From a paper:
The domain 2 of METTL15 contained five α-helices and one η-helix, which formed a scaffold for the binding of RNA substrates or other functional proteins. Here, we reported a series of crystal structures of human METTL15–hsRBFA–h44–SAM analog, METTL15–hsRBFA–SAM, METTL15–SAM and apo METTL15.
To further investigate the mechanism of m4C839 modification, we determined the structures of apo METTL15 and the binary complex METTL15–SAM. Comparison of these two structures revealed that the root-mean-square deviation (r.m.s.d.) of the Cα atom was only 0.145 Å (269 to 269 atoms). Comparison of the electrostatic potential surface of these two structures showed that the positive charge at the SAM-binding pocket of METTL15 was significantly enriched after SAM binding. The crystal structure was solved by molecular replacement using the structure of apo METTL1570–407 solved previously as the search model.
Residue numbers in the entry: 8 to 291, 303 to 314, 329 to 338
């Protein structure tokens, strides 16, 4: 949290929005530096939200826990009486929490086997499609588009073809099952003895899992909406600090901080919204002062609102 909080520079008497409370690390680090604050602690994950509620028992004056997605943040802040132009700082750490990555039943990680779930909202929305629903239902071209667009997976076609053939034999319901199917798309001479293809990053199924995660959790639209809410509720002179972990979300943060307008779904025709993957984050007056960019496999960007 150190560098994140460092760029925030919490001062006595200030008010903060942590939009990605997660395991609580940054919010706790902020409280260690300055206890005389108010902090709204938001997460879309019930598990993280329950940790924020617990924290609010030890810090009842400061902490206000909220359960909600980035796209729900504005309504939650309005219902809590929070006015635009209020926050001295807003924090968006886009990384998966340790609870998400280290609970195999959630199905985020390539380490231990578990259900191909991958919903950040956990059990909050039982009708929300899982990664399993997606890979068992979509057709080959649609799967390939998701993997190419969201995972930047050069081998989208072959991998999507392998999923479609595999799911005809048995439904794909587990993470290691999907990882094995992905690996089976590559001839042995492509991958033999290649230890990097098993390592934490650079694992052969990494981009596939990342693409499904972004799709299942609508991460690109959510992020853009969250950024606009952060800007609206920051006061003049307040700081936005964002931590990005892959290139699509970092490009969205970057473009946002440059005041470059990007795709609102309301501007897309119904046909495009149904049949095309999002182009957010893809290649094809001043509102901010950009005060930090640093690589920590994550990229921190910090800005002061003018």
């Amino acid at each position: 949290v150190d560098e994140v909080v460092h760029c925030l520079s919490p001062q006595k008497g200030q008010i903060f929005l942590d939009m990605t409370f997660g395991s609580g690390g940054h919010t706790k680090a902020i409280l260690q530096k300055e206890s005389d604050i108010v902090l709204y602690a938001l997460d879309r994950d019930p598990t993280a939200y329950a940790l924020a509620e617990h924290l609010s028992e030890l810090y009842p004056k400061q902490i206000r826990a909220m359960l909600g997605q980035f796209s729900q943040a504005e309504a939650l802040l309005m219902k809590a009486g929070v006015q635009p132009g209020t926050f001295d700082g807003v924090l968006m750490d886009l990384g998966c929490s340790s609870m998400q990555l280290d609970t195999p039943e959630r199905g985020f990680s390539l380490r231990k086997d578990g259900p191909l779930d991958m919903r950040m909202d956990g059990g909050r929305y039982p009708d929300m499609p899982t990664a399993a629903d997606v890979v068992n239902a979509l057709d080959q071209q649609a799967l390939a588009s998701i993997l190419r667009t969201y995972g930047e997976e050069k081998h989208a076609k072959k991998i999507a073809s392998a999923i479609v053939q595999a799911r005809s034999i048995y439904p794909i319901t587990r993470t290691q099952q999907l990882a094995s199917i992905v690996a089976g798309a590559f001839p042995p001479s492509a991958i033999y003895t290649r230890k990097d293809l098993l390592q934490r990053s650079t694992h052969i199924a990494t981009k596939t899992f990342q693409a499904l995660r972004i799709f299942v959790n609508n991460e690109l639209n959510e992020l853009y909406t969250g950024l606009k809410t952060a800007q609206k509720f920051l006061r003049p002179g307040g700081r936005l600090v964002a931590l990005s972990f892959h290139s699509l979300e970092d490009r969205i943060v970057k473009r946002f901080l440059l005041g470059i307008s990007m795709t609102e779904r309301f501007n897309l025709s119904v046909r495009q919204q149904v049949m095309k993957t999002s182009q957010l984050g893809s290649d094809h007056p001043l509102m901010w002062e950009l005060i930090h960019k640093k690589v920590l496999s994550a990229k921190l960007r910090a800005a002061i609102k003018l």
